[PDB]
Amino acid sequence: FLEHDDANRALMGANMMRQAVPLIKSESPLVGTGMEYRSAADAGDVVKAEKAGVVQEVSADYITTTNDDGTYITYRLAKFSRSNQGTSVNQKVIVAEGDRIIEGQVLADGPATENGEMALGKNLLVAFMPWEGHNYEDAIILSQRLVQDDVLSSIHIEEHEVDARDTKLGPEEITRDIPNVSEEVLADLDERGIIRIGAEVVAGDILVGKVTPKGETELTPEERLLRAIFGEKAREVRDTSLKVPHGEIGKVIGVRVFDREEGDELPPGVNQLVRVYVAQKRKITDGDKLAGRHGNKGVISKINPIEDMPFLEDGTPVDIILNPLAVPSRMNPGQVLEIHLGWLASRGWDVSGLAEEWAQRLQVIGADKVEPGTNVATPVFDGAREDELAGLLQHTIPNRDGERMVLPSGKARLFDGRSGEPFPEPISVGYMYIL
Amino acid sequence: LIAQRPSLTEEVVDEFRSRFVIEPLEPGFGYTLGNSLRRTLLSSIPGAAVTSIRIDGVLHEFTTVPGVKEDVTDLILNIKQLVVSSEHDEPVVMYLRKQGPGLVTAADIAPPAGVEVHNPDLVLATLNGKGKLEMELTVERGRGYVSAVQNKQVGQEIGRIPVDSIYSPVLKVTYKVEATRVEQRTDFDKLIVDVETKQAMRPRDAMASAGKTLVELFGLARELNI
Amino acid sequence: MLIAQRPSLTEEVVDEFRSRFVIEPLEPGFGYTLGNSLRRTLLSSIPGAAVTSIRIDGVLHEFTTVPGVKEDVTDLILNIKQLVVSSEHDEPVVMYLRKQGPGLVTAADIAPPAGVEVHNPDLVLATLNGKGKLEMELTVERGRGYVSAVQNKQVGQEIGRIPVDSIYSPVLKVTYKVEATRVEQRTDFDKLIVDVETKQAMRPRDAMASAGKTLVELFGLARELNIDAEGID
Amino acid sequence: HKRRLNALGPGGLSRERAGFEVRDVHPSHYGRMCPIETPEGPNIGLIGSLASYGRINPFGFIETPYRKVVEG
Amino acid sequence: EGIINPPIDELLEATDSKYSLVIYAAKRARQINAYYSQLGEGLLEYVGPLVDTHVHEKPLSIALREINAGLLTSEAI
Amino acid sequence: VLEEVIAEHPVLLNRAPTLHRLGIQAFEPQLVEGKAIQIHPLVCTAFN
Amino acid sequence: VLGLFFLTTDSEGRSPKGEGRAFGSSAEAIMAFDAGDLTLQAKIDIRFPVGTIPPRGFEPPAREEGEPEWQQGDTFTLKTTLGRALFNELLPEDYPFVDYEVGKKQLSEIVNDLAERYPKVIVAATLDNLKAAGFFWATRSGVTVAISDIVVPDAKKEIVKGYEGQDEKVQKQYERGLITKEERTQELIAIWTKATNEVAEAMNDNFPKTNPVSMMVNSGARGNMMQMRQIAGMRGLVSNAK
RNA sequence: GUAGG
Numbered sequence A: 001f002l003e004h005d006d007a008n009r010a011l012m013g014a015n016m017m018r019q020a021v022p023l024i025k026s027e028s029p030l031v032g033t034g035m036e037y038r039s040a041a042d043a044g045d046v047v048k049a050e051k052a053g054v055v056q057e058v059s060a061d062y063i064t065t066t067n068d069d070g071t072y073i074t075y076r077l078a079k080f081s082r083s084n085q086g087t088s089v090n091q092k093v094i095v096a097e098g099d100r101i102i103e104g105q106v107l108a109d110g111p112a113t114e115n116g117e118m119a120l121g122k123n124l125l126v127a128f129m130p131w132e133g134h135n136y137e138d139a140i141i142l143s144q145r146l147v148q149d150d151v152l153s154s155i156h157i158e159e160h161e162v163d164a165r166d167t168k169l170g171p172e173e174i175t176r177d178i179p180n181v182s183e184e185v186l187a188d189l190d191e192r193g194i195i196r197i198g199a200e201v202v203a204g205d206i207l208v209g210k211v212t213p214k215g216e217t218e219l220t221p222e223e224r225l226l227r228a229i230f231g232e233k234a235r236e237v238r239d240t241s242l243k244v245p246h247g248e249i250g251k252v253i254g255v256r257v258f259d260r261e262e263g264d265e266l267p268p269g270v271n272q273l274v275r276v277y278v279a280q281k282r283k284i285t286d287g288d289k290l291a292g293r294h295g296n297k298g299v300i301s302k303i304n305p306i307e308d309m310p311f312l313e314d315g316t317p318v319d320i321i322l323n324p325l326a327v328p329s330r331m332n333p334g335q336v337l338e339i340h341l342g343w344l345a346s347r348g349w350d351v352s353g354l355a356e357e358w359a360q361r362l363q364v365i366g367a368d369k370v371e372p373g374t375n376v377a378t379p380v381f382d383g384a385r386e387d388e389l390a391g392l393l394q395h396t397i398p399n400r401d402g403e404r405m406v407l408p409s410g411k412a413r414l415f416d417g418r419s420g421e422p423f424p425e426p427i428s429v430g431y432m433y434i435l
Numbered sequence B: 001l002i003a004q005r006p007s008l009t010e011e012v013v014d015e016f017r018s019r020f021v022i023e024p025l026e027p028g029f030g031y032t033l034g035n036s037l038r039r040t041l042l043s044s045i046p047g048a049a050v051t052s053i054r055i056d057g058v059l060h061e062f063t064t065v066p067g068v069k070e071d072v073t074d075l076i077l078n079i080k081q082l083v084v085s086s087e088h089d090e091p092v093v094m095y096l097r098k099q100g101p102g103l104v105t106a107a108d109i110a111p112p113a114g115v116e117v118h119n120p121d122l123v124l125a126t127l128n129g130k131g132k133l134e135m136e137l138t139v140e141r142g143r144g145y146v147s148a149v150q151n152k153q154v155g156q157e158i159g160r161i162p163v164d165s166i167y168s169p170v171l172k173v174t175y176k177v178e179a180t181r182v183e184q185r186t187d188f189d190k191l192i193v194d195v196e197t198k199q200a201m202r203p204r205d206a207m208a209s210a211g212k213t214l215v216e217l218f219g220l221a222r223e224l225n226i
Numbered sequence C: 001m002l003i004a005q006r007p008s009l010t011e012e013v014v015d016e017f018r019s020r021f022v023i024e025p026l027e028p029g030f031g032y033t034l035g036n037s038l039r040r041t042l043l044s045s046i047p048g049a050a051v052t053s054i055r056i057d058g059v060l061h062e063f064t065t066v067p068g069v070k071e072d073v074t075d076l077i078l079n080i081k082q083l084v085v086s087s088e089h090d091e092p093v094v095m096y097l098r099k100q101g102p103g104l105v106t107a108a109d110i111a112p113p114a115g116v117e118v119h120n121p122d123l124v125l126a127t128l129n130g131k132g133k134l135e136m137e138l139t140v141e142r143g144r145g146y147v148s149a150v151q152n153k154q155v156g157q158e159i160g161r162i163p164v165d166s167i168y169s170p171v172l173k174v175t176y177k178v179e180a181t182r183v184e185q186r187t188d189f190d191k192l193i194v195d196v197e198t199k200q201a202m203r204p205r206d207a208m209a210s211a212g213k214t215l216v217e218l219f220g221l222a223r224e225l226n227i228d229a230e231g232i233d
Numbered sequence D: 001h002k003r004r005l006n007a008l009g010p011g012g013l014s015r016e017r018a019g020f021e022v023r024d025v026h027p028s029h030y031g032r033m034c035p036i037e038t039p040e041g042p043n044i045g046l047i048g049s050l051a052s053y054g055r056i057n058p059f060g061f062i063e064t065p066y067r068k069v070v071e072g
Numbered sequence E: 001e002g003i004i005n006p007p008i009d010e011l012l013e014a015t016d017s018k019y020s021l022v023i024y025a026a027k028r029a030r031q032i033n034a035y036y037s038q039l040g041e042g043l044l045e046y047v048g049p050l051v052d053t054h055v056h057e058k059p060l061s062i063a064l065r066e067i068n069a070g071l072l073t074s075e076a077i
Numbered sequence F: 001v002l003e004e005v006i007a008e009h010p011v012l013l014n015r016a017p018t019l020h021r022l023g024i025q026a027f028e029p030q031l032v033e034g035k036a037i038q039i040h041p042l043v044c045t046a047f048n
Numbered sequence G: 001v002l003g004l005f006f007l008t009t010d011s012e013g014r015s016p017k018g019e020g021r022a023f024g025s026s027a028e029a030i031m032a033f034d035a036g037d038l039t040l041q042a043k044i045d046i047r048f049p050v051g052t053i054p055p056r057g058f059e060p061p062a063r064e065e066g067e068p069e070w071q072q073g074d075t076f077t078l079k080t081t082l083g084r085a086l087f088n089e090l091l092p093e094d095y096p097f098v099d100y101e102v103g104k105k106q107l108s109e110i111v112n113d114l115a116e117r118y119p120k121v122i123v124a125a126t127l128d129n130l131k132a133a134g135f136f137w138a139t140r141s142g143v144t145v146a147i148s149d150i151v152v153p154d155a156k157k158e159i160v161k162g163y164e165g166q167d168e169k170v171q172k173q174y175e176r177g178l179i180t181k182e183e184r185t186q187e188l189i190a191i192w193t194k195a196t197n198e199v200a201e202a203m204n205d206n207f208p209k210t211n212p213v214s215m216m217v218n219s220g221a222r223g224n225m226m227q228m229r230q231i232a233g234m235r236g237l238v239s240n241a242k
Numbered sequence H: 001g002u003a004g005g
Ligand SMILES: [Mg+2]
Pocket: H005
């Protein structure tokens, strides 16, 4: 629905469509342009097969295919390897075991991908109405259900390393014998002074133990006396071990080591290099930026429990609130079309023998009988006309009790979660993609 | 002027959904009554859920188990919505073991006595002919939501991993009001509260517990006065 | 399971009729249930008595003017509904007021029948010019909550009688606000501050005790489903 | 980021060199550049993505496919 | 229990300015903070808090309390 | 201890453009979970 | 400010049920409001307890009596809405009653008055109360946006085709060379300036005052007239490069 | 360099 959008906000959306982070589980948008499939396919993140045969083995680590000719090819799926910006490049598997394959057919989705189609976020049930100022100046309110079901949760893999270098005084050493330290600090480390795999870390945790070769130590009078009283030996070797930088958290997922004397080559001086992967699962929390396709972007300001959501007639809560004051001034009414079409897509429609102009247009287009949840396509400049939206809305399948739950106006009855009184007038509700 | 005390009646629409009607309610009460009932039922309700698991040959949730197309994290998401009922207040241990090619299921899981899964048809993952799944589960009981971050207590057992869990087995609640046939200006409203819940527990006992909680709170409010 | 801290209702008095009630921190997300429910039942469910209709001597329903009185009829309706009456007959009763001469006719000056007490005699009802002439009879009926004035054919039965709004609630208004508190290094706790404005007849805390008992009954009605236990204290 | 046309660079237009005229859209943009999208910062419009069907002339111009029309 | 608890207008009319009030209250705050940080010398020039004080307190709050009380006086050199 | 010490100690909030003197504004601190400053909606328009 | 404007609104904002009645006190008015018989936007009579300063314009008028009266600070009835009462109650007691719609400009005026005449602490408390009530009533207002909310004028198509009709006749009298291209451009831009002005006025006439976009633009909340013109009416003339 | 202000 770009045609109904001010260019300024379309520019904002297009610039904000290159920054969506993938999530644990990707889902294709319910409403969106029909070109997304090609955009996903041409990008190299997806893994497609070069032959048309029958898959022989389907495993997360690898997928084996055998063409009728006889060539066997095993695609290795990258798993949880750091990207350029530090997001997982996890890759799923879609094809079954015995299913026939065609050349170029998608075998495994990439990040932010689903069934070979682009999926840069998820789709939320959403309603337009102010709410106690917790959506003032276009701040956002989202239900705790997103905190509950990892609907918006993203992996983050950080990698940082340390180097053993032969300085003028001597060589640096990696070891579990760090000097001038407690015992428990070096608890989970390895034999050679490396953190094990799986050991969670916090700020100050020791990842790899490194010690300076030596240094000219003129021990001070006060320190001299202190050592004499406690009978401890200050040794020229000095601690230079790696520590987590302040304000961090994560589980170690992989560790790599390269060594000079070993067959691996290193730059001059550096004797050993160690890289550590620390990974976390950041859940959607206060302060996380968030934005719709049309450019409505805000910082989450509060996450109420599932009850305080202004819930709807059948008890479905709303998963996000939005400040309506935006959409007039920003001159970007595409999103109201989008939300209505999303509600339409969630609840299927049946149109047969209606003899209406819009009904005739769908029948000739063929999009007449639609089951609930099946996706839809609205090309950028040949999208759905408002008349089509109105007719389809008037002919939505009854979700429950044989009643259509949204009024023909596109507004429905909201029951305040906290007060319980039904809201004085209906409110607009639908399903919009969010990133 | 007329005095009429509330009267509750029940009806069942599905094996796990029921509608409960209270007609004598004062005007402009059924809404607040239904709201408090709904919120309390969702907020608090005893329940059981898996709380932390262990996988042989795996040291973190990020890696993958050979033999499954599903990575470990996919298994986390599969189990988080697994629904269980546990009678024991203290943690219990459950085991999932599967070999050969085929689907792994909740039914396949080894149930300890007094701990019962309630969604056997749920599929958790699939194994190849070469695959092997071995899994330890911890079944704890609680209420509401508990994230894995506060659910971690063992640091030495790196094999163990926490999982955020959901206890409340109620799915959704919806209340409606009407007008009573009684001839008067007040026009007493008729509240009807429909509750649908997961397979763990019947809605009747769920709202029995909710009433227990709320009546406790208001007994606290009243008795402490006068 | 057990609530980390048990709540404990407490009082803060600023006037014999105005009061504030505070709830010691509570399970998060519960504050709005309790406070809203309390608000509704305390405003409405508690019973009481109020006037129901009024009849001035020698006037018609369309004839809004009343001779011999400086004030009009409408302000008299406001003043009489402002009056609080405590009755228990459970059926309509009639109170009379027959006064003459110039001066001021007040609630003190009213002569009530048996079984009915007027709590506030201080209120001035009318100011008379010249001869008083005042003769007025009004109907009181116990009721529940608030009822809008309705036409019961009393005007048809006698042209003088007219309907009037009645306030059965012994309370006037309640304003409940929820705020956040920090306990055991956790901020997930909601204190309730409920300010009750009540008339002189009833003491507010007694009314809220009655309201709590009523809700306790209405929610013990749920125990009939089954017996279940929840962590508490 | 594959298909961007970065006008900033050596032997070419520089950030300080920018003017009103270069940044704005021109009637030849149709099919040769998406006039909608560009970084919002000081380099407004100087960077732009290629059009959807744009193909590259061997000399270095950008061609656009057009359907043929005859006698209506 | 907050910054605004002493209203400003009384202090302003007391000191007949805004900036003079700031420097004067700050001088008093410094004096009292020096007093609490004596830790034993007991210099006669230093003076304790004229108004009652909490177990833990910010000195400048007590300075402002004194000024609002109006008991403490100023005079330029 | 931190919750004890912060009260009655001003903090200057301040935005980057700082066009006019309403850029720098003193406030009382108050702890809150999450990782974001909170702010009082009335003063927001002074900062722009 | 949308909430406050929704609150201090004249009639017709809804079906004014329960209008034309008198109430003893604002408390019993709120009781009726909860009862649902009355609507917040409904002209009624209300009393006021003593100490309620009356409107500045209400100072000359007073109640009818043969004895001296001082209604500047005693009980007085007044014709107004529950909303205006609530809005006064937010304001401090000593402030005279305000009975006119607040919108945006008037709110700034009264805030200036308060900041001028009153101490700072009262100003802060009053602003805080205003904020709380404003958010609450914005929640209750029900402002939204929807496809039926923004209604295109019915007349537009007709008028524009007529205007378009004009256009092509000029083009015809240009294809014979009877007019220069420059003169054609000037007369076309004039014609379409007229057309867009007329369509803007038409749309301005069509929309009712109850729909949310009108409520928020008129309140001074957000937006301005031409945004509505180009979301509902045609954009009109724009500018090419240079 | 490139994103946000
Ligand atoms: Mg900004």
